[PDB]
Design a binder for this molecule. Structure first.
Ligand SMILES: N[C@@H](CSCC[B-](O)(O)O)C(=O)O
Ligand SMILES: N[C@@H](CSCC[B-](O)(O)O)C(=O)O
Ligand SMILES: N[C@@H](CSCC[B-](O)(O)O)C(=O)O
Ligand SMILES: [Mn+2]
Ligand SMILES: [Mn+2]
Ligand SMILES: [Mn+2]
Ligand SMILES: [Mn+2]
Ligand SMILES: [Mn+2]
Ligand SMILES: [Mn+2]
Lengths: 337, 337, 337
């Protein structure tokens, strides 16, 4: 057998202040509960559990609304804390060692990318999501941070981000030409404006319907990593998949990716040999029935396994078992006498 | 932003005598209950609620079976009543103003098309359905009117329709060359005979599998509206979609259209700028679980929004919010000092 | 109308010793309970019920584990019993008469193919499954016979099958070049080794994603029956279909075939005019909710109907009903006076 990645790191980030629905903090445990670790090992990969990042959760009286944003100071404090740990993990392993991150709501992405970009500043980002998550604070109708994580990272958008002192440590590390969306089907108007204005590459479900997922992946990589020179940060919101496949998530949107389409994305990104960080966001075991949570867990595991290099086409055994070395009479041997 | 249709009309038709399962009369309310109106408004479209048509529901003793048909006199009386109102609405708005109609079982289609054809006699019809709904009375095994609505409209079939005095006002206004089916997977034998005999264009799920939905739509329009000269009556039976997507309907048939395929049909028809009337039939909130009804409602809303011109690719904002006119210090401005 | 097959045989095999989960013995009854027979008749086909094969179910004390295998002696005794009956049925009908077989777990396949190959030795096999079912006894982690049925049949694998006296009657009748897989997504490593080593044709879900089901079917037939000269044994594991479509099965694996893709396989194989035996395995009415069992039953019926030649494009009536021979006044006739 052969493997692009022979070892990987696992990191849990139970962020739950990016959106009002409680349960995303149970995200990392939902994956740890599963047979994910067992399965990755059987594929011949050494997965090291790097524990969980403790997010900063201020008391409501310590964190009033600022510019409509909810839990903004918790966000800024958590962001920096994420960035510090991710940077350490990335520099420590600097045939690479991918970081698998499990959220947690998507607001964590500001921290992960920032820390990732501090170790590999030339990275590109593949954002798999039903939503843009690129609302700027004054344009956000909800005030939820999981809908704004990209806006603090994109240089071309900094004249639309309100200055806040606790936000100074969060320096924009992304050019608009380094991001590519796949799976969009619920963009806010101002997101659509910014995405088109600054030429951010995006492939919606409409594009997936007209082009096919195979062409979309090829075009997404062509746009942000044309010669596979750049490290890849793969940000995978679980709600990019259709709700029939992953119902246990906060903002489900019908008409999403099939599990197979999602797997194709991960398999292709994995095969570049350039997967640096994969993050899975918006898992919420407190939403839906037990069967719903089981379905969502199952989809998450298959997706993450795909990122680490698992092939549906099969894997060769690390040692071939021969029947005669075990001194056992085979049927072929019996009739030969 | 730009819009093909800037205003539209909403009309409810709670027909429930076209089929034995009670609940389709709650169809229009299921859509009114939803956020459909709110969402259409946010897309920049003025939706006017034109109320509901009161269908004629005779007492069983007033409406005995005739030629196997159930509730035939209720059908004829209701048909004419539908036709009168639809004609008024169409002539009143004669950049068009589309009519959105929500049923109600599919027997209403005889009335809507008749009234529509009275204002726009050169119309073509796109029938999205698992079934032909073109059984002639003596060939119908069930005797349900929702399985015969097209047969009273097609000129080439009038030698197969039993003469009834109360049916005189229902004059065939459709040539067989004006109809195109998409989504068929449960045709009765005599429907298959008539469809092939008179050269009615039809694309079954088999065709969708072998050609892809994109080619099917193009071929369907090519067959009945080759140069986008004709107004389009879009008759959308909800059971055309797969039961996994829309379970709350009377005659569900496995192996149907995905939500995405259905959306593609509506998006393309909408983009012709020729959508005159869109009708959605066979919603039944009294079938299946609450989650089933929620799923069916959700699918209906996304479909109808697609007809009115909603793009999954995003919509531009009607006014761009600038951070400096609001007199707020942006991060870009702060560092520039 | 026209029909490739005008008559067919139905045979139930309630095998339940190939896997630990009880309920697959209720498989044949689940199909008999359905409207399958009624529907096949309406398509104009004479289905003869050939009853059920009574599988051999030894007492645990009579059937200890041998080489890790569970219920191996029950397997060998049952296999021979299956083979004897299938051979009789095949020679008896030797425009062919297809055998429709309903399991029962997939361990029955050793018996059916053996008996089938005894009447038509030049047959090819189309294996539709999430799994290879080609584990050799010493390589099997589970020791379940439903995971090994193919290994006893493939000549190239006989040096990997442990000699057992009760297994002598089971002679390998298949060359590796006569088998083609469709739908694989959960191969064991040693299966992957054997499949690639001996050049067995296989198309995984990855292949289905990149090629499309239409190309996969064409390539599968090209590999094992290039000129439609060989009779076809179609072995269809229900878990080849996605769990959303067929949840009531023992080893469900996400990311499977849609119902439409499965139907395409059956429709194409049927259209060769070379369908000799179709078997449906792994139905288990004791797994999942009532709605789950209903969904699984429904999928099974549509699949089997497709094998017998049912077209979603419609069937012509065996006698056209004219309105005037019945002495009834048509609307066309009324206005003509
Ligand atoms: N426009 C919405 C987008 S929410 C999407 C959140 B997510 O992608 O993380 O699930 C908002 O600003 O809250
Ligand atoms: N052959 C059936 C067709 S029923 C289809 C009804 B509908 O398309 O409206 O759900 C019949 O005549 O009742
Ligand atoms: N590797 C597994 C495969 S089980 C597949 C069983 B079946 O295809 O019949 O559902 C085993 O040896 O038990
Ligand atoms: Mn999202
Ligand atoms: Mn997100
Ligand atoms: Mn229908
Ligand atoms: Mn209909
Ligand atoms: Mn299987
Ligand atoms: Mn199997």
């Amino acid at each position: 057998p052969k493997l692009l990645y022979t070892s990987a790191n696992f990191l849990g980030i139970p962020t739950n202040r990016g959106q009002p629905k409680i349960g995303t903090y149970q995200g990392p445990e939902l994956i740890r509960k599963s047979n994910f670790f067992q399965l990755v090992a059987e594929d011949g990969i050494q997965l090291t559990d790097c524990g969980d990042i403790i997010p900063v959760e201020l008391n409501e009286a310590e964190d009033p609304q600022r510019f409509g944003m909810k839990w903004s100071r918790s966000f800024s404090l958590t962001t920096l804390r994420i960035a510090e740990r991710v940077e350490e993990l990335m520099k420590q392993s600097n045939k690479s060692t991918p970081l698998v991150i499990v959220g947690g709501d998507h607001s964590m992405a500001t921290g992960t990318i920032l820390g990732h970009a501090e170790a590999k500043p030339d990275l590109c980002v593949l954002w798999i999501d039903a939503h843009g998550d690129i609302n700027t604070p004054l344009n956000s109708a909800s005030g939820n941070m999981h809908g704004m994580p990209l806006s603090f990272l994109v240089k071309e958008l900094q004249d639309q981000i309100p200055w806040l002192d606790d936000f100074e440590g969060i320096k924009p590390c992304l050019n608009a030409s380094n991001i590519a969306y796949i799976g969009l089907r619920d963009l806010d108007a101002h997101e659509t404006h910014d995405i088109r204005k600054h030429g951010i590459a995006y492939f919606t479900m409409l594009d997936v319907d007209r082009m096919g997922i195979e062409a979309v992946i090829k075009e997404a990589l062509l746009a942000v990593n044309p010669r596979l020179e750049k490290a890849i940060h793969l940000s995978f919101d679980i709600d990019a998949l259709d709700p029939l496949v992953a119902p246990s998530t906060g903002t489900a949107v019908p008409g999403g990716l099939t599990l197979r389409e999602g797997l194709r994305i991960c398999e292709e990104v994995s095969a570049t040999g350039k997967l640096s960080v994969v993050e899975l966001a918006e898992l919420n075991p407190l939403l839906g029935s037990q069967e719903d949570v089981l379905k969502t867990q199952s989809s998450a595991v298959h997706i993450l396994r795909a990122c680490l290099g698992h092939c549906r086409s099969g894997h060769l055994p690390f040692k071939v078992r021969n029947l005669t070395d075990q001194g056992i009479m085979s049927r072929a041997a019996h009739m030969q006498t």
